[PDB]
Amino acid sequence: MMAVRLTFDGQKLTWPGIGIFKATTGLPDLQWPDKQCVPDAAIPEGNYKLFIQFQGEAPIRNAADCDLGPSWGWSTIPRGQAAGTCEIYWANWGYNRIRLESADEKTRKACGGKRGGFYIHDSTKGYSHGCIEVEPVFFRILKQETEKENGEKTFTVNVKYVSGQQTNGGTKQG
């Protein structure tokens, strides 16, 4: 039941006491800590809450434009029904996503507060539209560790870049 504080340094997402997962943030030319105030770039540094409650399929906002609605939980991407352009766009989501929310004022006020809509997701592209792309095995570890626990399940992540290295953890499919 103990709280879990994940850490993310731009290349590695750590679950303390369990393991290290490859992870990536930002579009290809924006995977840098000095770009974190540019839309779709590396996520701003700070503290975020994860919504890990499993809520099934994500809502579809506009099917013609391939638009998914926001949801505060762990949801799935409807890849099986994708057609045409949505086969392209929803491959950038992957199969699973977990909503993030800024968890203090300093994080929320970052970048004039102009950025938002953050998630952890399991596409295998080697980039992310302003979110955190993680190795897919993370979601299977998450399931195994949480489904046997009865009590409270509290997950956060701290984002902190400690060098100028590219915020790319090698998540592109091998």
């Binding site: 638009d67 926001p70 766009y89 950038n92 989501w93 950025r115 809509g117 539209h129 302003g130 979110c131």
Partner: peptide
């Protein structure tokens, strides 16, 4: 906030 969109992602495409």
């Amino acid at each position: 906030h969109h992602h495409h």
